[PDB]
Amino acid sequence: TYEISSAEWEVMNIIWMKKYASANNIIEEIQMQKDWSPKTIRTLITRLYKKGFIDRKKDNKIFQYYSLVEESDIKYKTSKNFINKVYKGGFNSLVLNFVEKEDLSQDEIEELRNILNKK
Amino acid sequence: TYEISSAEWEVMNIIWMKKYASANNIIEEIQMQKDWSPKTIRTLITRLYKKGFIDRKKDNKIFQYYSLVEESDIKYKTSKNFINKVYKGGFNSLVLNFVEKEDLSQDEIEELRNILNK
């Protein structure tokens, strides 16, 4: 019923990769990159759970969290919002700004074209 | 750079679109699509001023604000940050993802090709 912060995106990205993950599995993966405590990280998991983004499945052993939101759509909708707030030429503007600013590689430029050719 | 808000962005996009503009100018370009008061907008101007994003020169005895930062440089930086926060792939996955949930006409694809190509 709202929208994700930078740390929930972190937590979420791990949950969309591991398909099913534990509070500890999540802390381990998150701690390889951020110096955040476990409290802090479980608080993010509890909150993500309370707003509905994820749920927690069991069956004996240990508690596991999983996604309730489609990765593809909350990321699409988030990019739509980002583009709507920063650029005044829609998606095309962002691509033009990125391409002119980053010296993309021949291999990067080529993956790009493939993505435009497949639809 | 120091990650600015959507309101701040609304203001910057006006300073950029006019090189120099006084509060009053800003207040009205803003009050045309936003229901913001005069003090709200003066606070946004003052906030970007203290953050080093804009500065002011006294023409007449009235302050005229202009940018201290390079629009495309700041929007680029901002884009890298957004992509690092949300996507794991990179610019790649955002374009992949966008080219896949936005039906996009067949010309939009052509225009997107322009950029990449010419």
UniProtKB/Swiss-Prot annotation, chain A:
Record has DNA-binding as a keyword: yes
Superkingdom per UniProt: Bacteria
Protein known as: Methicillin resistance regulatory protein MecI
NCBIfam families: MecI_of_mecA
Stretch list, region Important for dimerization: 70-119
GO biological process: negative regulation of DNA-templated transcription; response to antibiotic
Source organism of the structure: Staphylococcus aureus
GO cellular component, as recorded: cytoplasm
Site positions for Cleavage: N97, F98
DNA-binding region (UniProt annotation): 3-67
Keywords tagged on the record: Antibiotic resistance, Cytoplasm, DNA-binding, Repressor, Transcription, Transcription regulation
UniProt PTM comment: Upon exposure to beta-lactams, proteolytic cleavage at a single site impairs dimerization and abolishes repressor activity.
Subcellular compartments: Cytoplasm
